[PDB]
Amino acid sequence: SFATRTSLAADLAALGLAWGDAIMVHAAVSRVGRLLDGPDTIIAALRDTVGPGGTVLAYADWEARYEDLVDDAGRVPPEWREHVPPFDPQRSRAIRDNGVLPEFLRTTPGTLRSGNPGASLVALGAKAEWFTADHPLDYGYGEGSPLAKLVEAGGKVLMLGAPLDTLTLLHHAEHLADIPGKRIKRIEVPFATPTGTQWRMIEEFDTGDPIVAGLAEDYFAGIVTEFLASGQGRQGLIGAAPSVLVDAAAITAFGVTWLEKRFGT
Amino acid sequence: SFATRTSLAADLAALGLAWGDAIMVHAAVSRVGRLLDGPDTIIAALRDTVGPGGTVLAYADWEARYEDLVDDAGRVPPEWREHVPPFDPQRSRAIRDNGVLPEFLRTTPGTLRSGNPGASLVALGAKAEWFTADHPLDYGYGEGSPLAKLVEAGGKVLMLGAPLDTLTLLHHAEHLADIPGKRIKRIEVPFATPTGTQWRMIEEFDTGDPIVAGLAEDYFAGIVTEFLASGQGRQGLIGAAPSVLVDAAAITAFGVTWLEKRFGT
Numbered sequence A, B: 001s002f003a004t005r006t007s008l009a010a011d012l013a014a015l016g017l018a019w020g021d022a023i024m025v026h027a028a029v030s031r032v033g034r035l036l037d038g039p040d041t042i043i044a045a046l047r048d049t050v051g052p053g054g055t056v057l058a059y060a061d062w063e064a065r066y067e068d069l070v071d072d073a074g075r076v077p078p079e080w081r082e083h084v085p086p087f088d089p090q091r092s093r094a095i096r097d098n099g100v101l102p103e104f105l106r107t108t109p110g111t112l113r114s115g116n117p118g119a120s121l122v123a124l125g126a127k128a129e130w131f132t133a134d135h136p137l138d139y140g141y142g143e144g145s146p147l148a149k150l151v152e153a154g155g156k157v158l159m160l161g162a163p164l165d166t167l168t169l170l171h172h173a174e175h176l177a178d179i180p181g182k183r184i185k186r187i188e189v190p191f192a193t194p195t196g197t198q199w200r201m202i203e204e205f206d207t208g209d210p211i212v213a214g215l216a217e218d219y220f221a222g223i224v225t226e227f228l229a230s231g232q233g234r235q236g237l238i239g240a241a242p243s244v245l246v247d248a249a250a251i252t253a254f255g256v257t258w259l260e261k262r263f264g265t
């Protein structure tokens, strides 16, 4: 009748989560069942399973409701500029679109938050420094990004009952894919500085839709499904939530190959 | 089309919130309208209106799902004791039942959280230290409590679209009322200490139901309505939210008189 940090940690180990791992989690908290400590049960269970040498990560993004106001160049009209709350990595909230866990992780003491607002990750544990450091402001899903560092460190991604098309790391595969017609997003972003608000234009491949035309909006889920069908990754219950645990490097390489086989040369 | 930190602060001033006030807030965030910065717009507007000499407060309580497991004496069964997350004033989440604003305020840098878990308040501003110090663990809605200090400080309570029966300060009027048949609650509470988890029995007047039998659950709303009908307190719009602003000392005395005239002598 109550899942605990102990029972979830047992389920996470059974799924394959290992001591010392860097684990990025996408959680559908309601699907886990009744939790004794609410969403913090999940965070605590992940820390217990990877141990103090491990790191727990989540896709933070930022709640920035102002995008409904920008013009044709992605710039904020002058009458609205000073009313837009600037981005502060330590104070700006994580987005709500994909659940409350990223914000809960962000407000856990010790958690660090990377500097690219729309692509920001939160990290808590031994490698939090490094995972959140020097997030490039342009093409924040590409080289030198926290997602790239997750691949480089041999990290893992856990879909904890979350829809499989919300696996943020596959946007890093989209960035790396050598294919034509990649869609681009440009938008002005306000940053909080010790001297005041500083505006900057951000450019990246658009992650609000598939990177190229001819793909269903939810096509990431099919890539993960084919990934599991090929004998890679693990499936199992975390609490009451059907969950998927995949290797970050392997799913990235699989995603890049998937796109280059259908749209490259 | 967008309520801002500037517009909300103007609405608060028009309603009567003043420079230097100590203001306790109960908010229905969705009723305020379209917010550029989400719930933090409300918090910022409140701080702008009262200034650095004022204090912004909210009823935190704490997330304690283990109460479903206690026996008739309020004690946690031994098989569950080790698994119940202990209370940490700086890390335990605010209860989510009455909206997210208390939790957002709790995670605002500088905010302090008082030590009585079930009765805890968060406070942010000049008098945060004083409001949250030495919260008595027994009868935490009574003498020496943060609610008592709000009356002592000449504070105010703002119902920002929130249902009028959620005005926590009226539990302090319940505590002060010289009436017979007051219901009492006893429950075991785990505290986080530098020594480990320390369990303590907490006793208070029951705030989960009216202080005496024969009262509608929502009778607090009738008291507030009568208070306004008598010509006290102010009503007005904060954004799109119908709001009520009352003097903390005046509504407490009014509530005590209301109870002592219908019960007791």
Ligand SMILES: CN[C@@H]1[C@@H](O)[C@@H](O[C@@H]2[C@@H](O)[C@H](O[C@H]3OC(CN)=CC[C@H]3N)[C@@H](N)C[C@H]2N)OC[C@]1(C)O
Residues within 6 Å of the ligand: A061, A062, A064, A067, A117, A118, A119, A165, A166, A207, A208, A209
């Ligand atoms: C700058 N902040 C934001 C920016 O980061 C980005 O967010 C992306 C998000 O929409 C994508 O969601 C799409 O897929 C699904 C499937 N549940 C739901 C809604 C769909 N639109 C998500 N997969 C990847 C996010 N990076 O675009 C919006 C923004 C406000 O500009």
